[model samples]
Target: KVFGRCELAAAMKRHGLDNYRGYSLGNWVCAAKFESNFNTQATNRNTDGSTDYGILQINSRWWCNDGRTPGSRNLCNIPCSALLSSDITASVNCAKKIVSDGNGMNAWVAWRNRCKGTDVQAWIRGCRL
Candidate 1:
């Protein structure tokens, strides 16, 4: 699972950040550590009967919406699924997007703030696209 490392690095470069910087890479590794334990094959079921799949734990219900037929490509639009199917680098790219979409990195910072110092959100902020 490449998970968009190169693409994510590029995105971060565009944001005037250096790839592999200690803090930035540390942040990225932290997210991978906490989110799915770096397991690209991880899956979980939500209380609403929705399923999250793949390395990034993308919500299959929210992104795919269709049934969880193996090899289903409905979730291809999601960066993680796209990587799983074709790119193999979409997870990191997806993380970048999640971190960049809201308060740049602050949204992620806030998530970390509330997640009991899990550092997941802080990592996201540090690794924003």
Candidate 2:
């Protein structure tokens, strides 16, 4: 499902991910915008055979498992595809789990590659969060 940035911000705020660690809600929104463009069904198959699933583009190797994805630690104990829920509750939960593990935004290459050093406030400019 596709969602507007404000919609995503609202849901993410309700999920209380704004305060996970020292990251702000704008940071999360920035990552999400780059990660999936708010498309919950987004997936990218890596050359290594691991696929990134969810709006956050969670990987199957370390975080989640999809029965067909071998070698997954499944640390989150959730299917990789489950992160693509329209509800985003599970997505937020798993994202928090990833962040809580101390990876910060480092788990998402987009965060490190595109979001870093950018104007983060642009993510929630009109969201009023």
Candidate 3:
């Protein structure tokens, strides 16, 4: 699919990692690569019966309150459209909070170390940050 480069950049900038050091950007990119293949529209149903949706695979049950209202403002109270809006930076930031409590890049580092040497960019792009 189309890897949202603009959105990804925006996410990185918002996290103050436009010029992050070490394997930070690489790590985040790698995690996204593995998590959803960089697909902002990816979704999955966990064995535990949880549903994940959108680019960052946000779970509607936990993070989203729109499940009952179909468009209710939950958590950040932004519309679902805002959830996966073309502004990928917003999506990434949102996912970061849910996944790592604003420590997404750091979480990515751990993910990358676990899945290194896997050529994860075949599906994802703009990984250099």
Candidate 4:
């Protein structure tokens, strides 16, 4: 499923992304834009053979178990498949766990490269918060 800007913003906010782990809704929205462009079916296979899954691009090595990421920790205790669900609830939940584990928003390189050091507010501009 693909989501419009504000549509994803509102859904993320409803899922407790607003001010989650000290990162604002815009930050999450920005990460999603760069990571998956709001497409739930997005996946990125890394050179190391691990795959990034879903909108936030949760990883198979540490966050989700794909049964193929060798020495997987599955820190989020979720299957990688769950991240691809059209309902983003699991994605949001796992993201919260990532931050809560002290990784911060930098866990996603896209957020660091694109959303960081910028006025991320524009990502969610015109959205009813």
Considering only N, C-alpha and C atoms within 3 Å, which residue pairs clash in candidate 1? Answer: 3-89, 3-92, 4-89, 83-88
Off by over 4 Å in 2: none
TM-score, structure 2 vs. true: 0.93
Which is the leading candidate under TM-score?
A: 4
| lDDT (Cα, tens digit) per residue for candidate 1, span 1-129 | 434444444444454443432235445544444555555666677666666665556555434433544444543455334534323255455555545545443323322544434543344453344
Instruction: Give the lDDT of residue 111 in candidate 4.
Output: 96
Q: Give the alpha carbon lDDT tens digit for every residue of 9-98 in model 4.
A: 999989999998788899999999999999999999998889999999999989999989987999999999999999999999999999
Clashes of 1: 4
lDDT of 2 at 21: 90
| lDDT by residue (tens digit), candidate 2, 1-129 | 988998898888899987679888888998988888889999999877688887888888888898766687988889876787778888888888898997688988888889888887678788874
After superposition, candidate 4 runs with Cα above 4 Å error: none
* Order of quality (lDDT): 4, 2, 3, 1
Worst 10 residues of 3 by lDDT: 120-129
True lDDT of residue 123, candidate 4: 89
Q: TM-score, each model?
A: 0.48, 0.93, 0.54, 0.97
Q: Note the clash tally of each candidate.
A: 4, 0, 2, 0
TM-score of 4: 0.97
